[PDB]
Amino acid sequence: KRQHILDSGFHLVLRKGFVGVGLQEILKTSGVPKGSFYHYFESKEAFGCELLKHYISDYQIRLNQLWTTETSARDKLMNYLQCWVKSCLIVKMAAEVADLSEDMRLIMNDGVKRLIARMADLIRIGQQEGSIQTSVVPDVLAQVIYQMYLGAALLSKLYKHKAPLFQALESTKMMLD
Template sequence: MNLSPKAQATRQHILDTGYRLVLQKGFAALGLQEILKACAVPKGSFYHYFSSKEAFGCELLQQYVDDYGRKLELLLAEGGNGQQRLMRYWDAWARDPADPAQGWAEECLVVKLAAEVADLSEDMRRVLDDGVQRLLQRIAALVEEGRTDGSLPAGKAALDVARVLYQMWLGAALLSKLSQDRLPLRQAREATEHLLTCGNTAARLSPPND
């Protein structure tokens, strides 16, 4: 879509505003009129940029996963061995280095929307799942990096370990949101350190191959 700078700014304003609303209310419960009112744009303008609310949702999720990937690479670029870089990522779930008052888990659309979009929209589900699969590959690469540089012991296949860790942190993020307490995230961190530094434990906890 070829847009003028002004039109591109309007489109991005709709996406940014929609993101904040989706974090608060979810996707299905968020009406189009509420989006339009918050953005201060007419319905015709919305449909100029997005063919439907679902198309808007797909674009919002695609932008989210792309931005998440860039944010992760900036975080990892600070250096350190494989274990340190991996733990820096998990620490960011509880406390964002750029804003310690909150963590990445609090603004995670996977935590907020995974169950909802899986039943609501196949296109949205695919966008979110593709983003998760890319993240799992990146986590697995960090595990392999740690094993290569000696900061982590050998163990089960790195991608299996990545899945177990991510599943655990998703659950911790949900419980933290429910209880309004960061304790589940702190406990997930302790469990992560134990799992990563005990190769045999990682092997036992990793999911079986299909």
């Protein structure tokens, strides 16, 4: 199976990144023999493209689970942000950008922008309902929140604990007011 190659591949890029890992290593961790890679996939690069589309699609599914719900924009947003506390991928991919192909880098870039855009739509609905009581423009707040969390996550990784991200949830409560 082809999903078992993708899945085994996904767990390796989580640990090792995309560039640094060769086509050899992906074959052993999945068990599957070496001739069989090119049955399922045209190349390392078409494989990468397919992981990321799958990562992106699965991400939009989690999002919909999380935000097609009976609660208020603010709660949806806090729900989502809380899930960061329990993407080290954006870091690894940002850490390797020079070596990413354009096609892959553009996928990720489009993904992130759809993400920020949807956070903003939810800030707007929020401000509309009256659950988010700040006046700052959605497209701006979305970005501040998102950038804050990527930075908190970088420092959590580095520090080997989550105090940055716990501060980031506290600070969000203040900004939504």
